[PDB]
Amino acid sequence: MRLPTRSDMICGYACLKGTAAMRNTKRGSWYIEALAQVFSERACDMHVADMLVKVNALIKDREGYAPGTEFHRCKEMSEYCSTLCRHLYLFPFQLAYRLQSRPRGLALVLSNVHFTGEKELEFRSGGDVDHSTLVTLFKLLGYDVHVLCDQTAQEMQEKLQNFAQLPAHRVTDSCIVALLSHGVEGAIYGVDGKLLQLQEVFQLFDNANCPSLQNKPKMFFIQACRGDETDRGVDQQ
C-alpha cells in the first residue's frame, strides 16, 4: 500500500475565496476568537471537523461594528476543507486518529502584524491578541508551541520547511500550523509585501516531503483575507 502525495490534512479559513476576513482592532479576528472559544469548551467531546462547524455557526451570526465605514454591519463566512480519513479527537479512540503522544504534537503560530512594503498593507491591530490566544489555546490542548513574528515571505518559506523537517514529528501524533497575516486568494503576505503561496506551505507537510507525518492529522488555520470584496450581507427572507 502506497499513499497519495497529500492526505490527512484539515484547513480552516477565516473567510471565503474573494472576500475579506474581519478583525476587531481590540478583540482580534472574528475567526480566531470563535475558534478559541469553541476549542476551549468542546475539545473534550467533539472532533475537530465538528468543532469547525460550530465555528462556522458563530461567524455566520456575527456582524461588523465600524460606524461610518464600509465595514459597518458587514458579514463574513468561514469554511474548512478536509482530506481527513478518520475522526480527529484531540483527547485533552477506535475510529479516530491515534492522538495519545506527549506532546500531542508540535504547533507553530506565525503572526505578521507590522508591514513595510511597496504594497499598502496596514498594521494589524488586534493581531497580538490573536497570537497570544492561539499560543495559550494550543499549549492548553497539549502541543509544544513554536512561535514566529513579523517574517518576510522568504523567511516564512524557509522556517516553515525547518519546522516541517524537525525530528520530533517522527514520534508525535499530530501537527498544527496557524498563519495570521494579510493575504490574497491562495497566498499570504510576508512583512515585506511579497507573497507565499499556500499550496507551497501545504506541500512542505505532505506525504512526500514530510514522511514523519504520514497518516498523521495535520491542522492548518489561516487568518488572512482572500480577496478585496466586503460582504454587505443579505436580509433573511
Partner: peptide, 5 residues
Amino acid sequence: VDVAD
C-alpha cells in the same frame, strides 16, 4: 472597530 485582513 472591525477592519479587513
